[PDB]
Amino acid sequence: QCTVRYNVADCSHLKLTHIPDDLPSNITVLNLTHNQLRRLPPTNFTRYSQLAILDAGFNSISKLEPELCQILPLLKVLNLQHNELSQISDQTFVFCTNLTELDLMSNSIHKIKSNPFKNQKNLIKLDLSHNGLSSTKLGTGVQLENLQELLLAKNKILALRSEELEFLGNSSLRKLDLSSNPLKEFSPGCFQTIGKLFALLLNNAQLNPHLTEKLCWELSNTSIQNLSLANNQLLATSESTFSGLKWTNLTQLDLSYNNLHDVGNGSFSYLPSLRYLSLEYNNIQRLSPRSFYGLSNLRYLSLKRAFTKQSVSLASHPNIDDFSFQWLKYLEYLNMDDNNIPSTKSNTFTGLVSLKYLSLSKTFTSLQTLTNETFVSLAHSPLLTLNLTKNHISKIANGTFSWLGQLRILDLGLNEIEQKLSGQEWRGLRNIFEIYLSYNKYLQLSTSSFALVPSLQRLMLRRVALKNVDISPSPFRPLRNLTILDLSNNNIANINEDLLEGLENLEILDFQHNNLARLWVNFLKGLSHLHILNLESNGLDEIPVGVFKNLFELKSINLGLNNLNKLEPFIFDDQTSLRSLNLQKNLITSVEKDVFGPPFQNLNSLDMRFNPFDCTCESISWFVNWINQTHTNISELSTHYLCNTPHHYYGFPLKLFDTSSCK
């Protein structure tokens, strides 16, 4: 039966057929979702006349009794989605007044007569989607004074009369949704009849260029701001297409998923108030210097997947030409992901003088080499972020970035870079904060590799194969303010121990899968801000005393997947703030207190399973006792902590080891 938390009585997937009484009378909620109820007799609700929100979505309800509302005088949100209600009457919701949200989302209510919501002078959001409606008309007089969000998507409405919307004579609508209706015409004045219209959703309504043109006329001279037209048949645009919007202060426009092939010249010259524009998922063939004329106030532009695709046969690629964005002088964000553009041009980005975030992931096809001229079109953009993942880049040249003097994030991962870093690629990055090089072919380092980027703070070199790493002074030496150094899966041939000297601000160090055992001293020298340290998978099997001396800030240490067994007492003497310890899949035999006491003191989480535990009081008594009385999190205790010796204890669960009989 029903479970009852704070003031709410949840009875969701039980397959009920009756309304339960066991529940409190001090509840102001009641989730009867997803059951089997015939209907909701206006009498069985007395016990909880405190019901603030009755949620009976997804049942078999057929009719609603008028008395229900009055028997429940504090019903604010009623939900009857996906029920079986037939037709609403003039007398049904006649009592519900404190109502703020009514949802009749899925009841196949084909027709509406009279004024069924005359008294809902408080209803803030009405939902009548997915029925059989063929008219927007819900009344005869100016009613629903306070309505704010009318949802009527997924119906069968073919026309917007001026007559069938006047009941909103003075209703400040924030959102009218008519998505998924087969609109064949918009009569004159249809959208004017509303008090105020702010946001309109006409997705997936089968609109084409002409009907969209007549749509924008009917929108002239209304307070609309968000207009969404995604997923229609708007194959091309003219200057006349959006002209009717010059008489509006439109702000946001969605034009994705329309199969848009050709943006006419000046298709947007009457949108000087637009800030957000989406062109995602389309087939733009060309962008010319005239394409975005008029968008002098634009801020966010997404052209992700907005171009001509690959196609099965012909090698087709869009053609954006110099200056296409020369008018977007207030733009700060530009997403150009997932497209088949060949490369940049010496003036591709010119005019974007307020740009900050430029995304170019999986954007280019014919690049592969970056040169001193590739990004010259941004020499005048205050860029902070540059994404270049997935472009098949293989070489970066001297001075490539000298233009982006104000960059902070640089992302060159998932590429095929293959070269030696003389240090001159970064020439000019005065403010760079993070550089991402993970998932590349190979980088040959040098004494100067990062000499010109001292402001750096985060550097990732995962899965890259590093050459020339045992060189003094270390290649990481100039990075005094470095805080994250994630370089794993490189398997470095020789690691001189000078590495990492001077990284006083280092907080995270990732050195996994780098066969660190061979070269092995005292790696971690003065890294007293180290918090997270991962040395997983290095074939380690005899770790020195002193490598953790003075790392008082360690919160997690991961030495899993090595060959550790014998540990010198006091190694973890300084790790008393440790929250997490993982030595899983090692060769540990004993778990003594002179080694594991300190760290265990405050540990929130421990992972030490898959180890040849020796079941003898000398090896585990202290351990097994500690395990019984600690609040620490140990997972899979009962099954993945088994004893290995002696004979009689092969595979016996550690936690079951009797300790009483010990001394």
Ligand X SMILES: *[C@@H]1O[C@H](CO)[C@@H](O)[C@H](O)[C@H]1NC(C)=O
Ligand Y SMILES: *[C@H]1O[C@H](CO)[C@@H](O[C@@H]2O[C@H](CO)[C@@H](O)[C@H](O)[C@H]2NC(C)=O)[C@H](O)[C@H]1NC(C)=O
Ligand Z SMILES: *[C@@H]1O[C@H](CO)[C@@H](O[C@H]2O[C@H](CO)[C@@H](O)[C@H](O)[C@H]2NC(C)=O)[C@H](O)[C@H]1NC(C)=O
Ligand U SMILES: *[C@H]1O[C@H](CO)[C@@H](O[C@H]2O[C@H](CO)[C@@H](O[C@H]3O[C@H](CO[C@H]4O[C@H](CO)[C@@H](O)[C@H](O)[C@@H]4O)[C@@H](O)[C@H](O[C@@H]4O[C@H](CO)[C@@H](O)[C@H](O)[C@@H]4O)[C@@H]3O)[C@H](O)[C@H]2NC(C)=O)[C@H](O)[C@H]1NC(C)=O
Ligand V SMILES: *[C@H]1O[C@H](CO[C@H]2O[C@@H](C)[C@@H](O)[C@@H](O)[C@@H]2O)[C@@H](O[C@H]2O[C@H](CO)[C@@H](O[C@@H]3O[C@H](CO)[C@@H](O)[C@H](O)[C@@H]3O)[C@H](O)[C@H]2NC(C)=O)[C@H](O)[C@H]1NC(C)=O
Ligand W SMILES: *[C@@H]1O[C@H](CO[C@H]2O[C@@H](C)[C@@H](O)[C@@H](O)[C@@H]2O)[C@@H](O[C@@H]2O[C@H](CO)[C@@H](O)[C@H](O)[C@H]2NC(C)=O)[C@H](O)[C@H]1NC(C)=O
* Binding pattern for the stretch 339-378 against ligand V, x by CB under 6 A and - elsewhere: ----------------------------------------
- Tokens linked to 497: 């121990």
Report the alpha-carbon distance of residue 454 to residue 478 in Å, rounded. Answer: 6
- Complex with ligand Y: residue 372 or 455, whichever CB lies closer: 455
Q: Is 637 helix (H, G, I), strand (E, B) or coil?
A: helix
Residue 433 or residue 613: which is nearer to ligand U going by CB? 433
Contact by Cβ (8 Å): 296, 266: no
| Residue 486 binding ligand U, by CB under 6 A | no
Q: Which does 634 bind (CB under 5 to 8 A by kind): ligand U, ligand FUC, ligand V, none?
A: none
User: Residue 645: which residues within 8 A CB-CB, separation 6 or more?
Assistant: 589, 612, 614, 615, 616
What secondary structure letter does DSSP report for 264?
A: P
455 binds ligand Y (CB under 6 A): yes
Say if CB 301 and CB 328 are below 8 A apart: yes
Indicate which single residue of 411, 486, 510, 607 sits in contact with ligand U (rule: CB under 6 A).
411
Cα–Cα dist 449/128, whole Å: 63
Q: What is the largest CA-CA distance in the chain?
A: 97
What is d(CA 152, CA 136) in angstroms, rounded to the nearest whole number?
8
249 binds ligand W per the rule CB under 6 A: yes
387 binds ligand U per the rule CB under 6 A: yes
Q: How far apart are CA 29 and CA 8, in angstroms?
A: 5
DSSP characters for 190-247? Answer: TTTTSSEE-EEE-TTS---HHHHHHHHHHHSSS---EEE--SS---EE-TTTTGGGTT
DSSP letter, residue 150: E
Q: How far is the CB of 404 from ligand U (least distance, A)?
A: 14
Q: Which of 43, 46, 146, 398 binds ligand V (CB under 6 A)?
A: 398
> Residue 188 CB, nearest distance to ligand X (Å)?
23
Q: How far is the CB of 277 from ligand FUC (least distance, A)?
A: 20
List interacting residues with ligand X (CB under 6 A).
Answer: 18-19, 41, 44, 142, 170, 604-605, 624-625, 628, 631, 633, 659
Q: What is the DSSP string of 553-610?
A: T--EEE--SS------TTTTTT--S--EEE--SS------HHHHHHHHTS-SEEE--S
- Residue number of the CB atom closest to ligand U: 387
Q: Smallest Cα–Cα separation from 129: which of 109, 158, 146?
A: 109
* 3-state SS class at 624: helix
Identify what 405 binds: ligand U, ligand W, ligand FUC, none; CB under 5 to 8 Å per kind: none
Residue showing the smallest CB distance to ligand V in the complex = 424
Residue closer to ligand Z, measured from CB, 398 or 630: 398
- Note whether 253 and 225 are within 8 A (CB): no
* 406 lies in the site for ligand Y, by CB under 6 A: no
Q: Identify what 396 binds: ligand X, ligand U, ligand FUC, none; CB under 5 to 8 Å per kind.
A: none
**Site for ligand V (CB under 6 A): how many residues?**
3
List the x/- string, 288-327, binding to ligand FUC by CB under 6 A: -xx-------------------------------------
- Binding mask 198-237 toward ligand W (x if CB under 6 A, else -) reads -----------------------x-x--------------
Interface with ligand Z, residue 252, by CB under 6 A? yes
Query: Judged by CB under 6 A, does residue 248 bind ligand W?
Result: yes
Pick the closest to residue 178 from 193, 199, 163 (CA basis). 199
Q: Using CB under 6 A, pick the residue from 361, 381, 474, 534 that binds ligand U.
A: 361
Q: Are 291 and 320 within 8 A, CB to CB?
A: no
- Cα–Cα dist 482/508, whole Å: 10
Query: Where in 279-318 is the site for ligand Z (CB under 6 A)?
Result: 300
Query: Residues 118-157 vs ligand Z: string with x where CB under 6 A?
Result: ----------------------------------------
Q: Are 382 and 404 in contact (CB under 8 A)?
A: no
φ, ψ of residue 219 to 5 degrees: the values are -95, -20
In angstroms, the CA 658 to CA 662 distance is: 9
Q: Is residue 520 a contact residue for ligand Z (CB under 6 A)?
A: no
Q: Does 389 bind ligand U (CB under 6 A)?
A: yes
The interface partner of residue 142, options being ligand X, ligand U, ligand Z, none and the CB cut-off 5 to 8 Å by kind, is ligand X
Instruction: By CB under 6 A, tell whether 481 contacts ligand Y.
Output: yes
In this complex, which beta carbon is closest to ligand X, that of residue 67 or of residue 239?
67
Count of residues of this chain found to bind ligand W when the rule CB under 6 A is applied: 5
Footprint on residues 421-450 left by ligand V (CB under 6 A): 422, 424
CA torsion sign for 78, 123, 96, 60 is: negative
Q: Is 563 in the site for ligand W (CB under 6 A)?
A: no
Backbone angles phi, psi at 195, to 5 degrees: -50, -65
- Spatial separation of the C-alpha atoms in residues 34 and 79, rounded to whole Å: 12
How close are the terminal C-alpha atoms of the chain, in Å? Answer: 53
Query: Does residue 419 interact with ligand V by CB under 6 A?
Result: no
Binding site for ligand V (CB under 6 A): 398, 422, 424
Binding site for ligand Z (CB under 6 A): 174-175, 198-199, 226, 252, 276, 300, 372, 397-399
Binding site for ligand Y (CB under 6 A): 454-455, 481
Binding site for ligand W (CB under 6 A): 221, 223, 247-249
